[PDB]
Structures are given as C-alpha cells and as structure tokens.
Write a protein that binds this ligand. Sequence first.
Ligand SMILES: NC(=O)C1=CN([C@@H]2O[C@H](COP(=O)(O)OP(=O)(O)OC[C@H]3O[C@@H](n4cnc5c(N)ncnc54)[C@H](OP(=O)(O)O)[C@@H]3O)[C@@H](O)[C@H]2O)C=CC1
Ligand SMILES: NC(=O)C1=CN([C@@H]2O[C@H](COP(=O)(O)OP(=O)(O)OC[C@H]3O[C@@H](n4cnc5c(N)ncnc54)[C@H](OP(=O)(O)O)[C@@H]3O)[C@@H](O)[C@H]2O)C=CC1
Ligand SMILES: O=c1ccn([C@H]2C[C@H](O)[C@@H](COP(=O)(O)O)O2)c(=O)[nH]1
Ligand SMILES: O=c1ccn([C@H]2C[C@H](O)[C@@H](COP(=O)(O)O)O2)c(=O)[nH]1
Ligand SMILES: CCc1nc(N)nc(N)c1-c1ccc(Cl)cc1
Ligand SMILES: CCc1nc(N)nc(N)c1-c1ccc(Cl)cc1
Lengths: 547, 542
Amino acid sequence: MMEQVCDVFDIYAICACCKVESKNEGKKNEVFNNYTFRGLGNKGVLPWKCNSLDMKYFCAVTTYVNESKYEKLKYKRCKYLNKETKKLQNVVVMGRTSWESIPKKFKPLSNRINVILSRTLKKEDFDEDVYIINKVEDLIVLLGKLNYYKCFIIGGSVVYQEFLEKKLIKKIYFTRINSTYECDVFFPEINENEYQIISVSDVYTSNNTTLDFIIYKKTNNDDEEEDDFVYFNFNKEKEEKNKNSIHPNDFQIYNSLKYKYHPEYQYLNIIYDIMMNGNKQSDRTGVGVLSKFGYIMKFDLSQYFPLLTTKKLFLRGIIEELLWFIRGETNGNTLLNKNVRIWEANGTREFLDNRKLFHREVNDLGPIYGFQWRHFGAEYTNMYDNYENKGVDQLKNIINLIKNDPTSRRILLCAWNVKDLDQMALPPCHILCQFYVFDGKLSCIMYQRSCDLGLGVPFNIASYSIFTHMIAQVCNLQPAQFIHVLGNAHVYNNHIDSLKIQLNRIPYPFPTLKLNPDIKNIEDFTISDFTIQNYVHHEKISMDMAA
Amino acid sequence: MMEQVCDVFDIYAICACCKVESKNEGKKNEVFNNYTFRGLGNKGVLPWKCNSLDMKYFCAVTTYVNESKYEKLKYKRCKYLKLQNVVVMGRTSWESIPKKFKPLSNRINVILSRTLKKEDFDEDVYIINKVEDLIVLLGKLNYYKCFIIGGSVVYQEFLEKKLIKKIYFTRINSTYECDVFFPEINENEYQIISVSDVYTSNNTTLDFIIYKKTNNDDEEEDDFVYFNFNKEKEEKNKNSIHPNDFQIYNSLKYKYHPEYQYLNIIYDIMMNGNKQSDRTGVGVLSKFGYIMKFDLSQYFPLLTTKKLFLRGIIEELLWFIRGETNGNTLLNKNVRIWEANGTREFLDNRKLFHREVNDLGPIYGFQWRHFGAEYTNMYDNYENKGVDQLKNIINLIKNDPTSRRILLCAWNVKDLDQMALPPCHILCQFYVFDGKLSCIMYQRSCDLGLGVPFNIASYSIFTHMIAQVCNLQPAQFIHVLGNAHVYNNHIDSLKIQLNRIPYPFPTLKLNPDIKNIEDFTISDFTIQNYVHHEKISMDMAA
Ligand SMILES: NC(=O)C1=CN([C@@H]2O[C@H](COP(=O)(O)OP(=O)(O)OC[C@H]3O[C@@H](n4cnc5c(N)ncnc54)[C@H](OP(=O)(O)O)[C@@H]3O)[C@@H](O)[C@H]2O)C=CC1
Ligand SMILES: NC(=O)C1=CN([C@@H]2O[C@H](COP(=O)(O)OP(=O)(O)OC[C@H]3O[C@@H](n4cnc5c(N)ncnc54)[C@H](OP(=O)(O)O)[C@@H]3O)[C@@H](O)[C@H]2O)C=CC1
Ligand SMILES: O=c1ccn([C@H]2C[C@H](O)[C@@H](COP(=O)(O)O)O2)c(=O)[nH]1
Ligand SMILES: O=c1ccn([C@H]2C[C@H](O)[C@@H](COP(=O)(O)O)O2)c(=O)[nH]1
Ligand SMILES: CCc1nc(N)nc(N)c1-c1ccc(Cl)cc1
Ligand SMILES: CCc1nc(N)nc(N)c1-c1ccc(Cl)cc1
C-alpha cells in the first residue's frame, strides 16, 4: 500500500458556505447543484455576520478528541515516518486573513493548537500562543513532531484551494447556510470525481436561516455479545421480496451514504422500504401498486418547512385549496377560476355519474373537506347553499380549545363523516388532524388512510405543515411538529423508475415558510400572505414518464 | 490474567425447556417465574417430540463459526493452558439422537460416559470418562465454541462446578409430560441479557433468551459524534426518574420481544415526557405520536410483565358489536368499565341533564351500527337507521379486499356532545393481502399505565374476530398513539414493571364455528398458555 499524507496525519477541512447573490439574468427557474453553496466571506468577514449554531458545530468538531484512539494514530504516523520505539488536542490551520478576522477575546481558538500560514508575518509579529509556518510543507513537518488528535484546515479560500490542490484533504465538513448574502471570496468548486458526499445531517434554523451539515470524502482511485446478534437473526429471509425486480445497483448513491439524517429521508426511506418489501396489488382494477400498511413521519416545523428538495414542487395550488377548505367551499369552479385543477377530474359529469351522483351539478364536489370542517352534521344540498349556523364548525371549535383548553386531548378536526361518504365525489384521504399543545408550542398529527407516495404525499406534507403554521399563528403559539401517519401507503408501478432517480438525489437544506404576521383569524388568510423562502431543489420530475 | 475455565475455554450451554404438568391441577399456574420453563425430556425423547423452529435455532447456533475471531481465542487459550464447534452431550442424550443425524454434522461430537468404548466410534467422534477430562480434550482440539447440548445430569454438574459461560435457553410456552428437568438457575449466578422476538411453531409460541454468567473503519465513527453535537447531554426527566432503578432494563443487550414496544414507550415518556397538569389537578408526562405493531400470526400480545384480565374487555367488545349504549347491560355482568361515566353527576357535568343514568348516549356501539341516525335513548329500536359501518367494513373485506376505504369510525363530530364522553379509539382501518388481515387503530388519548394494556388486547381480539368471519388469517395489529401519557401516580409501578423480563406471549383461540360477527359469546374466547409476572396496582395508593 502507498500511504497518502492526508490519511496518515488525518488532515481535514471544515467550512461554511452560503448561496451567492446571483445576477438573476431573468430566470427564476434557477438551476441548483452543490456549487450553489460556495460563498465563504465578504470584505474580510463572514457574509452572514454570525450563526451561533454553525459556530457551535465548528467548535464541537475542532475541539473533539478521543484519547483512546490516539495510540493507534501514534503508531500509524510513527510507522509511516519509520520512527518507533498535557491534554490531547486537535490542530487548526488558518490563513493570516482569517486569523485577523477573529475577535481578540476568541484568539487563539481555545483548547486547540492554532497554526497560521503567512509570509508577510513571522513569529515575532504575534503575541499569542500560536505556530507560524510559511508553507504547507512546514505543517506536515510540524505534524510529524506534535502529539495531536486531528488536523482541521479551517479557512481562507486561498488556504482551502491549495490544500485541495495538493490533495491533502481526507474529508470536508461542509456547512450549508441556506440563504443568500453578498460575497467576494468563494470555496473552490469540488470535483465530483474526487469527493463524494457520504453523510447528511438533520436540518436546523439559527439566526433566521436554515442550514445543515454534510461530509465529503475523498473517492476511489465485547464481540461475542455481538455473536448473539448473529443468532437472533437466524430465522430471516436472505433477500428482500422485490430485489430481483428492483435491483440495488440502481440505488448506488442512496446506498453509499453512511449517515442519512436529513428529514427528507423519512420520506425517501419509506419509498425504498415499499419498493423493496411492498406487497403487489391492483389498488384500482388494472393499475397495480406495491403497498405497505402503517408508517409515521415527523417534521420539526420550528426548524424548517419540509418541502421536498429531491424534486421540484409548487405550492400555489395546495395553498388555494387550503384557503378553499377554510372558507367551507365545495364549489370546484372556484379553484378552476384560479387555474387550480386539483379537483377538476373529480367534478365531471361522468365521474359524478359513476359515483351515482346523478343529481349533482358538474364541479359540485358535495359534502367534502370544506363542508365538514365548517358544517359537519348538516344536510348537504348544493355548493351554492348558505349553511350558516348549521352543523358543527369544527375549525372554530378546535381553535377555541387550543386557546382556552390547550391540554385537552380532544382537539380533533375530522373529515371522515361516515354519513356523507357516498355524497362526496371522493371519500377523504386525510381522515383527521389532532393537536397537542405544550409550553406554548403546537404540534399536529394527521392520519392519512390512503397514500400515493410518488405524487400525493409530497404535497400532503406541505399542505398540513402550512395548516399547522396557520393554526399556530391565530392561536398565538409557535409551531412545533407535524406528524404524518400513513395507513395504506403505496407506490404506483408507473412511478417506480422516477422514484429510483429521486432516491439517488441528495437532499438540499429545506426552505422556510413565512406567514403574514398580521393575520390573527384563520379566515383572514389570502394567497399573498404566504411565502416559501430559499427553496433549493433538484430538477422537476414527471413521476409518470409516459408520452 | 485468565484462569477460570468457563470464560477461558468458551464453554456455553444450550437447551430448550417447556412447562410441566401436575396431576393435582394441570394448568394456569397461580405463580410463575423463570423456573416455570424446566421440562427437558420424557422417556428418552423431547416432551414436545419436535419443534422445527427450535431445531433450526439449535443447529444455526451450534454450527455458526466466525474464523476471523478465532485467533483472539487461540491466542489466549494457548497462552493459558474448517473451524467447527464442539457439542458435548451424554450417553442417554446421544442415544436419543436419530440414526441419519448422528453424528451432528459440521460439529465435533463429544460424549460423557463411564461405559462407552472409544475404540468403537470414529476418531472425529471423541469420548470422555469425566467432566474435567473435557477441558483436556479442548486444550488439544481446534474449535470455535464449546456447546453443552447437555442432558439433565450433564447440565447440572456443569453448572455446579461453574463451567458454563452462557445458557442459550429456549422457552417452549406449552405444557408436556416430563420426567427429566433442567437445574433451577441461580438468579445470582446467571442473568438474562437478551430476549428475542416471539414466534409460533408446531402449534406453540416460543422465544429464545440468553442467560449470562454474572462476572460479578473508525473513520465514520467520529462523524456520528459530530452529528450529535447539538443534542441535550442528559435526558429531561432523568433527574426525577433515576436510572439506577431500571438496572435490569438497561442491562439487557438485545430486547427483541414485542412487549418491549410498549415498555420502550413507557421509558421514552418517563425520560423525555413533557410535564402537564389536567384541569383536574392531576399530573402526567406526555408525548405525541407513537406506533406499535404486533404480529398476531405469531402470538397474542397480552402483556406478561404484569397480570391482565380479559372477560370485561371481551364483553365490552360484544356489547359494541350489538350496538348497545345501555350501561346497565355491562353492570349486570359485573363489567364496570363505564360505570363512573354513567352516573347522575358525571352526566350532569357533561351537561347531559336529560340523559338517564347509565345511558351513555351515541357512543361506540351506536356509531358502529347506526352512524348518522338521531339518538333518542338506550332502549330505542334503531333497526335500519343510520350507517351500519360494521356490516359495511366486513362486506368490503370480502368483496373488495384491496379497498383503501375500509374504515370503522367512532368519532362522529355531530354526536360528541351527546356522548357520555368522546371516544378514545377514533378509528380502525383494515388492510388485506394474500388472504391475511391487518388492522390499524388510532387512539387519540392513551393512558399508558392502565388503558393501553387493555387497548392492545381488545383490538387484537377484534382483529381475529373480523379475520375469522371473513375467512382470513390475522396478520398485524397496528396501534397508533396520539396523546400518549403516563400519570405521575403510576411512575413507581411502571419502574417496577420496566425491570421485569417479558415471558413468551400466549395465543388466542376462538371457537372456529363462529362465522358471523354477531354470533360470538363469552365462551367462544380462550387465552392459552398465558405466563405472567404478578399483578401490579399501577396506583400503589390503595
Ligand atoms: N465560511 C468559512 O467557513 C470561512 C470564511 N472565511 C472568510 O474568508 C475570508 C479570508 O479568506 P482569504 O481572503 O481567502 O484568505 P486566507 O484567510 O486564506 O489567508 C490568505 C493568507 O494566508 C497566508 N497563506 C495562505 N497560504 C499560504 C502559504 N502556502 N504559505 C504562506 N502563507 C500562506 C498569506 O498571508 P500573508 O498575506 O501574511 O502572506 C495569505 O495571503 C474572510 O472574509 C473570512 O471571513 C475564512 C475561513 C473560513
Ligand atoms: N430439552 C433439551 O434441551 C434436552 C433434553 N434432553 C432429554 O433429556 C433426557 C436425557 O437426560 P438424562 O437422563 O439426564 O441423561 P443425559 O442425557 O445427561 O446422560 C447421562 C449419562 O451421561 C453419563 N454421565 C453422568 N455423569 C457423568 C460424569 N460425571 N462423567 C462422565 N459421564 C457421566 C452417564 O453415562 P454412563 O451410563 O455410560 O456412565 C449417564 O447415564 C432425554 O429424554 C433427552 O431427550 C437432553 C438434552 C437436552
Ligand atoms: O391528497 C391526496 C389525495 C389523494 N391521494 C391518493 C391516494 C390514492 O392513491 C388515491 C385515492 O384512491 P382511494 O384510496 O380513495 O381509493 O389518491 C393522495 O396521496 N393525496
Ligand atoms: O380504552 C381506553 C379509554 C380511555 N383511556 C384513557 C385516556 C385518558 O387518560 C382518559 C380519557 O380522558 P380524555 O383523554 O378524554 O380527556 O382515559 C385509555 O387509555 N384507553
Ligand atoms: C462559524 C465559523 C466557521 N464555521 C465552519 N463550519 N467552518 C469554518 N471554517 C469557520 C471559520 C470561519 C472563520 C474563521 Cl476565522 C475560522 C473558522
Ligand atoms: C432441537 C434440539 C435442541 N434445541 C435446543 N434449543 N437446545 C438443545 N440442547 C437441543 C437438543 C436436545 C436434545 C439433543 Cl439429544 C441434542 C440437542
């Protein structure tokens, strides 16, 4: 074996990059990739001033050491050097400009061996406890003489550039600041053939922006208490049901990831699980699907808006649909006039007639969502009727319970009115919403009886996450979690190839949802009160590639 | 410094025990414990004759060998004094094994005897005159692990002289005639460190537990720590719960027994639960959103870490099925589940001033058979009024199994205020695949310490009932919990419960002649082989 320097001395890079203030040539159909995050600094400082969470992360990684693993590293570096026979710290290497950008109260970086690269400055020019080198070679020499855990290259685009040039980086701990700021210095474009992403963290919010942490890796070219584990798995099948028909070589990127902590994976793993272990059925005479029963996804709305990034989604339609529900409408023309066709196919003469709704006007969807939310129990007549003070206004009652009886375990909004099912153009897929209120925070569980993983679910997650924010706001609470429970979860055969593609796309940090803060009544929201910010995403996918 | 054989030479013991029958009384013991499973053999053979699953387990365990981890053993043993394992047995034992199966393939067969002729058998088939002579044969051979597939006698001595490291004990949860038994393991010398998932095979459930000798690449490893950089160092309520208490629960390495799905939630709530105070002045710890799954095809999920009675909840189920809302019907059968909710005072506080005592209103039963009808009183004849959901879901399961609309819903928004109390079990959704039925039940409010245990049982039974009247085999019962809480008053009790090791689940037997959901009677239900720890009053108040 030919030992590479970066491996022997464990030299890593850690940075944080934001999106660059682009010169929008008039194409807000922007293309996104990993290079989207390349902003390092502006006028000597960080483009975003400060970010306490990234700072905390940076400190955590560069100060962490495991003394028990040291002896193994010592033997390795010493053997490599042919050299063989008070707290262990990591080393941090930075350019002079980065060193000078650090406030005096933070210099030198605590509990770490600070190394500074410079030509214009020498040891005499510094008062602090630091090592001044004037070339990369001098670092390798220093490392072969120091007792240290790991070496992190912390900065200066110039510094990053040459260390990557000389191929001295074993891994890149890369922070993705999901927002745009003015920049004048950038991180070098990472050659995808030289570095692959192996892990993606959870997504967070800090200082009014979402962010996540990813790791790039340099590419190709008691134990018996563990044996008991082997035994317990004795009665297993050796391969997953649909392996032969699905083929894993297709999920290359998906399976090459070590840590998949990005929330979008809750959705991706379910798809993968259904594809690999799903039961073959013909949901609706002829179509055909793979299905499973019972899954739960959780999303932290205080930390991000879970709009899928592995593909492109628009939300104007589902938002208008939601406002439409809240208004208690069941008139399909209202949506059609707003160019939203979600319910178009379910309101045609033929569809209604086949539901035996012979006396139902076209686009009159019947006692669905809207009607149940505001008038559950009333006798439905037609979509133009005024159902004032008729039936139960669940929506209003849940808002009142949340305001005056927050700990109640009866705060539910139900659309599944057994008595009206047959009068509905379609029985509802979203059976109910239940709320939980703790320490001024609102969580929501939504139970879905039927789930089209490929086409529907992505939008459903968005709709209810938004709804949770809306209810939270009119009740003076902060949104916490949106919990999605899936009953019959299926993947349509026609969607398989498109989903295979999606699964091999690495998520981007989620976007954020902003509601007009002035709205205080659930009924006063209008389309312009909603804004999805920093939505970074992969190319849109036609789940059904038919032509 | 190695010098105490058992750990040194890696000697293990593997067995399979069943329950014993007593001529005085043949079943449903008053008190159970680990010694309940001691049956070893009967008249030269196994009490149960055969169990294919256990056969597979015994084989897999005794033949499994990992060579990469061998020299770590060759190193210290030599340093102490086609890799296969050693299977030490006795004469009676070796003589019970069939012809074609002797010697045990891929294994180094050894035998404890005082009259067997070494000269008669093969060389790869050693023999020994005494226990201590075994150590010797080991110091000469090249094996992986030494398994004592024993024999009553063989087991005993090996245990007394303390030569056993681990005891891969299989629990066959069924009673058979026995003449030979396994030695009562000393709880202070050995402890259970693992409990597998439960299974059904050859008409009995069973599980595998590992008894242990109380001694009393890294590249992506640091990455795991970095990604945990922002997580709370200590657990929220750890300070008020105290882990020294859950010492057995935390000592377990592998907890694959399904009961742990319930136990783990109790633990999660106690350790990370949010403190809240009902408008009653009572306090709870609560979490939001959990899911448990039980494979009814392999076992009936009746908690074993405490005692559970089912007559009441079965009658309640039959009561729902009849569509009744008459609280008196249950009281006259001494089922008082709904008594408190039917009193004059409770009804009045619900503002049901015009409701008769014990007239629970349009609850479960009324919704299952007449959803939509106008409720009058518990004595009215609602025949043909409202939607008969029960009848409908059953016809859907039979004629349109792949339907994703087979739901039974009790949360009638229009009738809630008329109900003595809103239902906790909102709905049941069914799923059918390959002639098998699964059911999801969503519970909006869950009393983990007292309610959930019965809740899991009720709906598991309901699943079997629906499955049978539709000629389907039960598959999974999936329990979705919404507001899941633990009353503060139960904490000490649940701590105790958390430190009990689950026994193998029992099975549920329904009278197979019943083919209509409405024809079941209390005598058509039988719980078999229910082994459990003693009863625990969740509220140790009195
Ligand atoms: N987002 C992030 O993660 C990070 C952002 N930053 C930002 O980046 C900007 C600073 O980066 P940038 O301008 O690229 O400069 P650097 O901080 O990389 O420093 C460049 C200087 O370091 C010295 N140097 C670099 N390589 C060598 C070498 N091989 N031998 C000797 N000296 C060497 C020289 O010092 P001299 O001039 O004395 O000869 C040189 O001009 C700032 O705005 C800072 O806020 C910095 C680190 C991380
Ligand atoms: N369920 C389970 O997991 C198991 C069940 N069994 C069942 O147990 C029954 C057999 O058990 P049991 O009757 O106790 O007999 P064993 O199978 O243990 O055989 C005992 C024989 O081993 C020999 N022996 C005893 N002590 C010594 C010693 N100190 N040194 C050398 N040899 C010794 C004797 O042979 P000799 O007469 O030549 O002196 C003796 O009669 C069977 O029905 C079998 O099916 C057996 C193993 C496991
Ligand atoms: O908001 C929605 C509406 C519908 N569907 C899907 C689920 C099913 O694939 C199909 C409805 O068919 P049934 O389950 O009702 O039969 O539409 C969704 O995923 N989300
Ligand atoms: O079958 C049942 C019925 C009730 N409960 C519990 C949940 C709550 O602790 C209490 C009902 O009070 P509310 O949730 O409605 O407030 O009873 C159960 O766990 N299981
Ligand atoms: C929050 C700072 C930070 N976060 C990350 N993820 N990487 C870094 N390299 C730095 C950093 C920036 C400037 C200096 Cl001067 C030193 C280190
Ligand atoms: C299926 C048999 C089996 N299963 C388990 N779990 N343990 C055992 N000790 C045996 C066994 C019983 C009798 C003989 Cl003779 C050999 C081995």
